[PDB]
Design an enzyme around this catalytic site. Sequence first.
Site, mmCIF file in Angstrom:
data_model
loop_
_atom_site.group_PDB
_atom_site.id
_atom_site.type_symbol
_atom_site.label_atom_id
_atom_site.label_comp_id
_atom_site.label_asym_id
_atom_site.label_seq_id
_atom_site.Cartn_x
_atom_site.Cartn_y
_atom_site.Cartn_z
ATOM 1 N N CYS B 106 39.671 54.017 39.266
ATOM 2 C CA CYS B 106 40.500 52.871 39.016
ATOM 3 C C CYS B 106 41.933 53.222 38.604
ATOM 4 C CB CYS B 106 39.857 51.952 37.975
ATOM 5 S SG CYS B 106 40.844 50.410 37.739
ATOM 6 N N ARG B 109 43.784 51.277 35.186
ATOM 7 C CA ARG B 109 43.296 51.427 33.808
ATOM 8 C C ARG B 109 44.357 51.372 32.645
ATOM 9 N NH1 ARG B 109 39.870 56.802 34.471
ATOM 10 N NH2 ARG B 109 41.176 56.954 36.353
ATOM 11 N N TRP B 278 43.163 42.171 39.075
ATOM 12 C CA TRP B 278 44.004 41.640 40.110
ATOM 13 C C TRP B 278 44.317 42.719 41.105
ATOM 14 C CZ3 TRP B 278 46.104 41.716 34.951
ATOM 15 C CH2 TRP B 278 46.976 42.794 34.708
ATOM 16 N N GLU B 283 45.304 46.911 48.989
ATOM 17 C CA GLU B 283 43.893 46.533 49.110
ATOM 18 C C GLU B 283 43.691 45.510 50.239
ATOM 19 O OE1 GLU B 283 41.333 46.440 45.117
ATOM 20 O OE2 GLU B 283 43.464 46.137 44.514
HETATM 21 C C1 HEM Z 1 43.757 44.467 36.518
HETATM 22 C C2 HEM Z 1 44.251 45.236 37.490
HETATM 23 C C3 HEM Z 1 43.343 46.206 38.283
HETATM 24 C C4 HEM Z 1 43.805 46.957 39.279
HETATM 25 C C5 HEM Z 1 45.280 46.948 39.795
HETATM 26 C C6 HEM Z 1 42.703 47.727 39.804
HETATM 27 C C7 HEM Z 1 42.781 48.594 40.857
HETATM 28 C C8 HEM Z 1 41.754 49.244 41.465
HETATM 29 C C9 HEM Z 1 41.779 49.900 42.777
HETATM 30 C C10 HEM Z 1 42.944 49.996 43.806
HETATM 31 C C11 HEM Z 1 40.582 50.424 42.965
HETATM 32 C C12 HEM Z 1 40.160 51.231 44.201
HETATM 33 C C13 HEM Z 1 38.836 50.737 44.732
HETATM 34 C C14 HEM Z 1 39.134 50.103 46.045
HETATM 35 O O1 HEM Z 1 40.252 50.346 46.585
HETATM 36 O O2 HEM Z 1 38.221 49.387 46.523
HETATM 37 C C15 HEM Z 1 39.756 50.133 41.824
HETATM 38 C C16 HEM Z 1 38.457 50.518 41.660
HETATM 39 C C17 HEM Z 1 37.714 50.267 40.533
HETATM 40 N N1 HEM Z 1 38.137 49.547 39.407
HETATM 41 FE FE1 HEM Z 1 39.932 48.762 38.994
HETATM 42 N N2 HEM Z 1 41.569 47.429 39.060
HETATM 43 C C18 HEM Z 1 41.935 46.487 38.099
HETATM 44 C C19 HEM Z 1 41.036 45.928 37.196
HETATM 45 C C20 HEM Z 1 39.775 46.466 36.915
HETATM 46 C C21 HEM Z 1 38.818 46.011 35.928
HETATM 47 C C22 HEM Z 1 38.992 44.740 35.060
HETATM 48 C C23 HEM Z 1 37.778 46.848 35.973
HETATM 49 C C24 HEM Z 1 36.443 46.876 35.194
HETATM 50 C C25 HEM Z 1 36.231 45.944 34.269
HETATM 51 C C26 HEM Z 1 38.050 47.849 36.959
HETATM 52 C C27 HEM Z 1 37.183 48.875 37.265
HETATM 53 C C28 HEM Z 1 37.116 49.504 38.481
HETATM 54 C C29 HEM Z 1 35.975 50.228 38.978
HETATM 55 C C30 HEM Z 1 34.612 50.461 38.283
HETATM 56 C C31 HEM Z 1 36.382 50.742 40.349
HETATM 57 C C32 HEM Z 1 35.526 51.566 41.339
HETATM 58 C C33 HEM Z 1 34.716 50.546 42.169
HETATM 59 C C34 HEM Z 1 34.004 51.235 43.306
HETATM 60 O O3 HEM Z 1 33.555 52.384 43.096
HETATM 61 O O4 HEM Z 1 33.914 50.641 44.423
HETATM 62 N N3 HEM Z 1 39.267 47.596 37.520
HETATM 63 N N4 HEM Z 1 40.498 49.417 40.905
HETATM 64 C C1 LIG Z 2 29.212 51.534 49.603
HETATM 65 C C2 LIG Z 2 30.283 51.235 48.587
HETATM 66 C C3 LIG Z 2 30.393 51.974 47.404
HETATM 67 C C4 LIG Z 2 31.401 51.660 46.477
HETATM 68 N N1 LIG Z 2 31.519 52.371 45.327
HETATM 69 N N2 LIG Z 2 32.262 50.642 46.739
HETATM 70 C C5 LIG Z 2 32.180 49.915 47.890
HETATM 71 C C6 LIG Z 2 33.158 48.783 48.155
HETATM 72 C C7 LIG Z 2 34.288 49.121 49.145
HETATM 73 C C8 LIG Z 2 34.890 50.508 48.893
HETATM 74 N N3 LIG Z 2 36.329 50.291 48.792
HETATM 75 C C9 LIG Z 2 36.734 48.961 49.194
HETATM 76 C C10 LIG Z 2 35.458 48.136 49.035
HETATM 77 O O1 LIG Z 2 35.446 47.551 47.726
HETATM 78 C C11 LIG Z 2 36.093 46.280 47.645
HETATM 79 C C12 LIG Z 2 37.361 46.337 46.796
HETATM 80 N N4 LIG Z 2 37.153 46.936 45.481
HETATM 81 C C13 LIG Z 2 37.771 46.308 44.341
HETATM 82 C C14 LIG Z 2 38.187 47.259 43.208
HETATM 83 C C15 LIG Z 2 38.998 46.381 42.272
HETATM 84 C C16 LIG Z 2 40.373 46.228 42.455
HETATM 85 C C17 LIG Z 2 41.119 45.402 41.627
HETATM 86 C C18 LIG Z 2 40.463 44.711 40.620
HETATM 87 C C19 LIG Z 2 39.094 44.836 40.455
HETATM 88 F F1 LIG Z 2 38.477 44.150 39.491
HETATM 89 C C20 LIG Z 2 38.355 45.667 41.272
HETATM 90 C C21 LIG Z 2 31.181 50.198 48.828
#
Ligand code: HEM
Ligand SMILES: Cc1cc(N)nc(C[C@@H]2CNC[C@@H]2OCCNCCc2cccc(F)c2)c1
Lengths: 411, 407
Positions: B106, B109, B278, B283
């Site tokens: 993330c 953070r 957000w 994304e």
């Molecule tokens: C508020 C602004 C936030 C931004 C700008 C942000 C941004 C991102 C981005 C770009 C990713 C990459 C995953 C992807 O591209 O799909 C990500 C993943 C992740 N974020 Fe954040 N996030 C935010 C809020 C949060 C919050 C509130 C949480 C948890 C309470 C969080 C926890 C995580 C986790 C656990 C992942 C990994 C998810 C996965 O493995 O698919 N984020 N975040």
């Molecule tokens: C198979 C599998 C594993 C894994 N860890 N994850 C996935 C979701 C895919 C991966 N990558 C894009 C899509 O996930 C969807 C977008 N992920 C949102 C992260 C995010 C961003 C901003 C705020 C938030 F609260 C959360 C699939």
Amino acid sequence: RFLKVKNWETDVVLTDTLHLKSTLETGCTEHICMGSIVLPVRTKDQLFPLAKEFLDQYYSSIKRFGSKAHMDRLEEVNKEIESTSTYQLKDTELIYGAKHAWRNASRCVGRIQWSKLQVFDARDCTTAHGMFNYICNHVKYATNKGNLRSAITIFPQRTDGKHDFRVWNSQLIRYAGYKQPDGSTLGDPANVQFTEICIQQGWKAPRGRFDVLPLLLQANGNDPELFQIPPELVLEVPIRHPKFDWFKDLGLKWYGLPAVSNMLLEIGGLEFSACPFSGWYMGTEIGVRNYCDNSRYNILEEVAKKMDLDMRKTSSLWKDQALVEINIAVLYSFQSDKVTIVDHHSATESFIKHMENEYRCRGGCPADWVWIVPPMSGSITPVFHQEMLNYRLTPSFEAQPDPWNTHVWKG
Amino acid sequence: RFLKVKNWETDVVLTDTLHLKSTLETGCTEHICMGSIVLPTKDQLFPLAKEFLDQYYSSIKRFGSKAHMDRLEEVNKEIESTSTYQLKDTELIYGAKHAWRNASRCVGRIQWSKLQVFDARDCTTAHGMFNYICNHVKYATNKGNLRSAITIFPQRTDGKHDFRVWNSQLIRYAGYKQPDGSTLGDPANVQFTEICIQQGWKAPRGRFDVLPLLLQANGNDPELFQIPPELVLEVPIRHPKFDWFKDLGLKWYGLPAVSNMLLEIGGLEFSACPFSGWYMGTEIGVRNYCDNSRYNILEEVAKKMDLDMRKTSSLWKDQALVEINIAVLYSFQSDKVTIVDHHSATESFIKHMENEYRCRGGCPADWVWIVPPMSGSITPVFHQEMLNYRLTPSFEAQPDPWNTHVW
Ligand code: HEM
Ligand SMILES: Cc1cc(N)nc(C[C@@H]2CNC[C@@H]2OCCNCCc2cccc(F)c2)c1
Ligand code: HEM
Ligand SMILES: Cc1cc(N)nc(C[C@@H]2CNC[C@@H]2OCCNCCc2cccc(F)c2)c1
Ligand SMILES: C[C@H](O)[C@H](O)[C@H]1CNc2nc(N)[nH]c(=O)c2N1
Ligand SMILES: C[C@H](O)[C@H](O)[C@H]1CNc2nc(N)[nH]c(=O)c2N1
């Protein structure tokens, strides 16, 4: 055992068995991944095994595993090692090793080409003048008037580690860096230090934005000597844009031959510390990194200015916009001059095909995702969506400490 | 044992020590690095509980105090007697926030400490879950001025009483397989749309149809709900220069709300715990719009721009990709929905690494996910070595409920 890599765009799942031929360590452990860390003299005892592993691999490849020729050669090597404590590779074994080092180069997107390497055997070289001549010939052959040919020149292996051959330059052709008292840099900021060592060694610096450094060459562990590459051997391309006529006035150019000179070739446990190699560029190396790193020519500002983009908010994507046009320009310029170059779309697609073939024929293809994915437009290239396993095979190309840091000055 | 991270752009070198306090296993070994792979009892629980409560009381500067010792005994007596234990609100708030703090993937953070935590441990039905979720969506959305938040349903018991939200996000678009051979809407949700329709959802069969929630309470059979449409803030997509862009029919939803993950606090597992923050612009523009396996709009956009699509080397993919992302950012800005661009997001994260290294002894970061899917090397994260490792509390991926559940 088996390991599976998936592609998230295509769902094509591959199986790696080759990683079982990997003994060298990575930096990673079960507790820590060091995948984004850039940087994570031998006894008889340890040598014969490395030679043995290497020559079983060579012998397998030519379909002679177990032959008389094979056995006699293990015997021959065993003996040379017991007797002189080192050994000489045959021509055929050098060629095969240098190739496979490239083929095992996991940070290299350009490996589809691995079998086509021109090898220059420079193991008879004794002086820094000898090296210069070898290097000029290499530059000339590889350049081939714009129709670039991949090549590697291989100078004598390490012996006692006190008589090393080294090429002090990090690439054969690179531009000078010049830190000014005002704190600004003139030319390429990455070469300031090495540029200082050249001046200090007696090089008369032109002090321009694009001065080709002199070759600084060590032979037989002696102090390195200065030489100048013949300017007629240095192919350069001025950078212009197809639609943007002001682009040429930015004054940019770049050399055509990328030639890495600071790596160590390990083959059969032998260490080749001067082994300069070259291919051709992928456009982003110049247009993204060389031109647009903050710590390089850093032209993004000047280019977005000319384009009159909105520069008051990063969210105008102004940098991304300038970035693309500069990279358009690099590719356009090389193509118009008929200097081999490849764009990042085509290079990554070729690499995907290479990689899959390698899985079929070899049981794997080690790949360092962090380096394989281009520094722009990452996810719209197919390597982004490709899981990769990264592991060390020999023969191999390694980084080595810069020689000004280790060299014992004779005087 | 003390590891150094270098920034190759600034020559700044940080020293990591937090990693020795790492507990889970990464996927990598001495021989093989898996950095690029997407998915690399009573006796079991008490060390996990202890490990957690130790860090908690250390965070409130009361380590070794009587208040600390008393809790550790109370939890011990509950585990021995009930097979599990219950977290205090304060421990729950701390755990959720810290799971975010530890999410190595993330980029966002810097915000970790402002998580709004909704304690939904008293929920019992799927309707209960629906109320709680709509309330989360509305609070978090905040008429466009988004606020990070998470809602936590009851923790796993014997594992046959799991609460789950079957959607991967609270708000996603339906995927329909067409007689044409192609796909309508979002290809990433075909499987899930089928499942919803199987359970009895009248699909509008359009391109940007907002999916129904599938809520599993107490390990029961999941039920369907529609999020009130007036809660789903969506943004029409236009471009500040290109008049025609709008005629592509593009829209996106403001609230990214990940709902398929599992939260581990002190060995207790919370399997339904949707959280939202957000969007970072890339994304939607780069991934959601441009991936071959997604809305895949590069081809169509390039044509309206009239670029030379004859050859890769004209960089027409790259050209259109930029402007697609200009549009996304501009559209969200024009409607006053919070969004952040990839430059500003990564810059903020570099500030956040420095503070974490200075304050915590380090920051687990996964370079593969941190670096934006466009323009990597012009973002500072590109040049930053990171160390990836697993700390707890954590968010973890878990198997899709349909592969597992039995009806
Ligand atoms: C508020 C602004 C936030 C931004 C700008 C942000 C941004 C991102 C981005 C770009 C990713 C990459 C995953 C992807 O591209 O799909 C990500 C993943 C992740 N974020 Fe954040 N996030 C935010 C809020 C949060 C919050 C509130 C949480 C948890 C309470 C969080 C926890 C995580 C986790 C656990 C992942 C990994 C998810 C996965 O493995 O698919 N984020 N975040
Ligand atoms: C198979 C599998 C594993 C894994 N860890 N994850 C996935 C979701 C895919 C991966 N990558 C894009 C899509 O996930 C969807 C977008 N992920 C949102 C992260 C995010 C961003 C901003 C705020 C938030 F609260 C959360 C699939
Ligand atoms: C066909 C021409 C080639 C292309 C287009 C190509 C492409 C690339 C690129 C883009 C990189 C990383 C770029 C960077 O950040 O420096 C790389 C790395 C590398 N390449 Fe290739 N390459 C080519 C030929 C070769 C040759 C001929 C060799 C040697 C036989 C080679 C060996 C390596 C090695 C060892 C690395 C890792 C570099 C390092 O660790 O600094 N490549 N290649
Ligand atoms: C510190 C450090 C370690 C390491 N292994 N490597 C470096 C070279 C850096 C990497 N990134 C910028 C610079 O690399 C510049 C050299 N890259 C050329 C690769 C190439 C491409 C096409 C054809 C070829 F023959 C070779 C630095
Ligand atoms: C820290 C990080 O590993 C470092 O900046 C890497 C990232 N990827 C790269 N990829 C290539 N091709 N060349 C590089 O120099 C780098 N730098
Ligand atoms: C194979 C590779 O791990 C995969 O494509 C990853 C790369 N980095 C990513 N990074 C983010 N933020 N999101 C992703 O979905 C992915 N996909």
